[PDB]
RNA sequence: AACUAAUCCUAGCCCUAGCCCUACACAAAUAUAAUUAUACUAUUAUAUAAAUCAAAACAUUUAUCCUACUAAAAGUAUUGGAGA
């Protein structure tokens, strides 16, 4: 997402009121474009055996592209939500 | 230089412009460019026999006019329908289902003269 | 009229409805007789019973114009009474 | 040549260029009618 | 003639109607309610306990004091 | 002359009279309340006070959101609160240069999304921000149900919400028929969002859609005055007999 | 010694106060070349207001226009080819 910032100051409006804007308050400068940020990883718990990643019940940190396109869409994995973690850990312990 | 205010009629304009003066259609045009009149579409005047009729256009000045009382739905119901229901109710032979016995019509379909939507002229 | 009320309860012989025209006004529309249902009639479908947003400005201008006429009328009546009371 | 005669009347042209159906065909033409109604014109269109 | 009665300010607490759309907003604030008690004492009917800060408000006051 | 009411209060006045008044109470509340959407295209101030560097004094600060344009195509997809930014820039990034028109456009993708409660796959135009919000909500169905209208920002999204809410409210067996065990698991997982069916019917409806719905409810053919008078006569006569 | 002329008072209007509205006007006709009793052939506003003008020219900029309670804090803090 593109994030912008005013060049010109906007005077304070008050507590319940809204500022009145002028045509000079429509000039912006770009502070950041989020698409260029370093990428993160996605946490998932495997539900079925898969090559080179794991077998079952093991949390895996994967690239967002792979996790959203292959594992979750095909049903091989589930979100590492607190509830999903709790169910899988109990099954592992009993096993 | 044209006149914007006068009415647009078929006497005006070129040959190919034509329109009606409000007379109702009495037939159909087919292909082959032939007009075919329909008999049922031509209005028929129902004229009564006036022999031996006592009423004339004017009335005598000595005839007393009456207090005006426009007819209402309540008045019609009491004069026509109320007496029959009252007698039957006393006898006990009355039910809501058989209102048609007293002249009620559930729907106007099938009638030649439908009261809504009206399907006949004056 | 009385007989129609008893049998159908309708106050008018001809069907109609309240609709908004393309100029932003509310008008009574009288129906016509047709051999086919409305959704198959291409000449009828070209007729529009709605107003687009550019009409909102004119709706306000009509309301204000009507307001000026009423104010002048009431003002004139009050002034005329002053003359009558003075005379009599 | 002598000028002053540019109006060569034709009813078909007149009704197509400035008529009722022509004015309603576009939103700009519909606003033409609204202005003349607010002014009170006796003649909305040709 | 006889002159009409002198103009007088209306006495007593004033409670504006909340539902009415044309009542001024400033008259509907808790500050305005507090003023009624200050001017007219107990006859206002304002629950006296309300004048002090509520526990949620108190935490905000203390938090700001430490900061500055 | 002057109007009796200020212009900005005209909308509220309309909802207070006519067939609009007959609408159910809480749906009128939804229209009335307006909540500001979560920031997307600007950074909010962390604090309420800041130290002005030049004079070294404490000053109040406020958050003023950027105006964003939402093309009507956005209502057919699920954009993650994004929109078009129409503005100006200074050439060469110095205030003394020319002022130039600028438009910043979101990057749009086509994706396929699956809903468990509805058991259907949709094809939708979407932004990368929307996908991340789905992950943080731990599923596509959670995203729709949790997010409020202003953040959701799509007419399609509000229609999806009505379907899910009505499906859960009625416990409709149409979900995975012949597998009652599987259906029970799905409905239980989303048990927190259940609301009464009556409320669910009017969720996401526009004012025009609401009015048409209300008109259909109360439309009725008139009653013949013949029956009405008969009831009065029988009622009177029966009491007289008593 | 009079011709052309001249004298006149009320039709209405203007600015405020008050108040939302519920006026949406027999029959018939009209979106077709409107005001033509019936099928042909479908129907649908708008991406940021600009410039003049002030700066004794002009290129960043220029109150209102582009509305959010009165009185004060105050033409103060702040912004500005730090200048209008
Ligand atoms: Mg000429
Ligand atoms: Mg100059």
Cα Rg for chain F, rounded, in angstroms? 27
Q: Which of F64, F102, F142 to mutate to test the interface with A (most CBs of A within 10 A)?
A: F64
Q: Which residue in this structure is represented by tokens 């898969």? A: A50
Whether residue A55 contacts residue A91, with contact meaning beta carbons closer than 8 Å, is answered with no
Burial bucket for residue C15 (CB in 10 Å: 0-12, 13-18, 19+): middle
Q: Nearest by CB to D31, from C54, C61, C62: name it.
A: C54
Q: Which helix (H) or strand (E) holds B34?
A: strand B34-37
Q: What is the resolution of this structure in A?
A: 2.9
Q: Tell me the CA–C1' distance in angstroms for A24 and G80.
A: 13
Whether residue F92 contacts residue A30, with contact meaning beta carbons closer than 8 Å, is answered with no
Q: Cα separation of B67 and B35, whole Å?
A: 55
Q: Cα separation of E50 and E60, whole Å?
A: 17
Q: Residue D30, Cβ neighbours under 10 Å: how many? A: 17
How was this structure determined? It was done by cryo-EM
End-to-end Cα separation, chain E, in angstroms: 68
* Tokens (6 digits) for C10: 């309708």
Count of CA atoms in the C-beta half-sphere (13 A) of B26: 7
Q: Which residue is nearest to nucleotide G28 (CA to C1')?
A: B22
User: Hey, which bits of C1-88 come out as E strands?
Assistant: 16-20, 26-30
Dihedral of the alpha carbons of F128, F130, F136, F138, in degrees to the nearest 10? -110
Which residues, other chains included, contact A44 with Cβ-Cβ below 8 Å and sequence gap of 6+? Answer: A59, A60, A62, A67, A71, A72, A77, A78, A79, A80
Helices (H), chain B: 73-80, 82-91
Helices (H), F98-224: 128-136, 140-146, 149-152, 155-170, 180-189, 197-200, 207-218
Q: Cα separation of B84 and B104, whole Å?
A: 13
Q: Cα separation of C44 and D17, whole Å?
A: 24
Q: Which of F11, F211, F226, F229 to mutate to test the interface with C (most CBs of C within 10 A)?
A: F226
Whether residue C49 contacts residue C27, with contact meaning beta carbons closer than 8 Å, is answered with no
Find the closest chain D residue to B2 by CA distance.
D9
User: Which of residues 22 to 61 on B have a Cβ less than 7 angstroms from any strand G atom?
Assistant: 22-26, 41
Chain CA centroid to CA F91, Å: 40
């Amino acid at each position: 997402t593109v994030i912008v910032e005013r060049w010109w100051k906007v005077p304070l409006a008050g507590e319940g009121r809204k500022p009145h804007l002028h045509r000079r308050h429509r000039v912006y400068k770009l502070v950041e474009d989020t698409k260029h940020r370093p990428k993160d990883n996605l946490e998932l718990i495997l539900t079925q055996s898969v090559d080179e990643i794991g077998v079952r019940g093991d949390l895996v940190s994967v690239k967002k592209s792979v996790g959203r396109n292959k594992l979750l869409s095909q049903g091989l994995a589930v979100y590492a939500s607190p509830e999903n973690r709790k169910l899988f850990e109990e099954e592992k312990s009993l096993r | 230089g044209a006149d914007r205010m006068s009415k647009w009629t078929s006497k005006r304009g070129p040959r190919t412009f034509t329109k009606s003066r409000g007379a109702k259609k009495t037939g159909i045009y087919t292909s082959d460019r032939k007009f075919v009149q329909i008999k049922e579409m031509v209005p028929e005047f129902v004229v009564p026999d006036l022999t031996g009729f006592k009423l004339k256009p004017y009335v005598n000045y000595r005839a007393p006019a009456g207090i005006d009382t426009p007819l209402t739905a309540k008045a019609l119901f009491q004069e026509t329908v109320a007496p029959a229901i009252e007698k039957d109710f006393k006898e006990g032979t009355f039910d809501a289902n058989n209102l048609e016995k007293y002249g009620f019509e559930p729907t106007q379909e099938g009638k030649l003269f439908q009261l809504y939507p009206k399907n006949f002229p004056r | 009229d009385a007989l129609r009320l008893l049998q159908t309860g309708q106050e008018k012989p001809r069907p109609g409805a309240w609709r908004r025209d393309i100029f932003g006004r509310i008008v009574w529309h009288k129906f016509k007789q047709w051999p086919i249902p409305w959704y198959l009639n291409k000449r009828y479908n070209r007729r529009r019973f709605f107003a687009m947003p550019y009409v909102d400005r004119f709706i306000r201008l009509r309301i204000e114009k009507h307001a000026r006429i009423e104010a002048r009328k009431r003002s004139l009546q009050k002034k005329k009474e002053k003359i009558l009371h003075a005379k009599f | 040549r002598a000028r002053g005669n540019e109006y060569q009347p034709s009813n078909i042209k007149r009704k197509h260029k400035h008529g009722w159906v022509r004015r309603l065909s576009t939103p700009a033409g519909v606003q033409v009618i609204l202005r003349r109604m607010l002014k009170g014109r006796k003649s909305l269109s040709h | 003639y006889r002159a009409p009665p002198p103009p007088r300010r209306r006495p007593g607490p004033h409670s504006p109607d909340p539902e009415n759309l044309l009542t001024p907003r400033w008259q509907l604030t808790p500050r305005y309610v507090a003023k009624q008690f200050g001017r007219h004492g107990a006859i206002s009917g304002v629950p006296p306990a309300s004048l002090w800060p509520t526990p949620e408000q108190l935490r905000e006051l203390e938090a700001e004091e430490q900061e500055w | 002359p002057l109007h009796r009411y200020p212009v900005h209060l005209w909308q509220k006045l309309r909802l207070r009279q006519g067939i609009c008044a007959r609408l159910p109470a809480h749906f009128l509340r939804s229209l009335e309340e307006e909540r500001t959407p979560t920031p997307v295209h600007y950074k909010p101030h962390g604090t309420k006070f800041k130290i002005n560097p030049k004079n070294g004094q404490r000053e109040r600060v406020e958050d003023v959101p950027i105006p964003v344009h939402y093309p009507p195509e956005s209502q057919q997809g699920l954009w993650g609160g994004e929109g078009l930014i129409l503005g100006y820039r200074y050439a060469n990034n110095d205030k003394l240069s020319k002022r130039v028109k600028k438009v910043w456009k979101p990057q749009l993708f086509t994706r396929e999304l699956y809903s468990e409660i509805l058991d259907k796959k949709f094809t939708v135009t979407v932004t990368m921000r929307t996908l991340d919000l789905i992950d943080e909500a731990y599923g596509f169905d959670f995203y729709i149900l949790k997010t409020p209208k202003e953040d959701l920002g799509s007419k399609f999204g509000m229609d999806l919400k009505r379907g899910m809410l009505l499906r859960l409210a009625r416990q409709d067996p149409h979900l995975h028929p012949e597998n009652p065990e599987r259906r029970a698991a799905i409905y239980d997982k989303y048990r927190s969002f259940v609301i009464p069916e009556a409320e669910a019917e009017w969720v996401g409806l526009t004012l025009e859609e609401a009015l048409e719905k209300q008109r259909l409810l109360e439309e009725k053919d008139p009653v013949p005055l013949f029956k009405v008078y008969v009831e009065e006569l029988v009622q009177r006569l029966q009491e007289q007999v008593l």
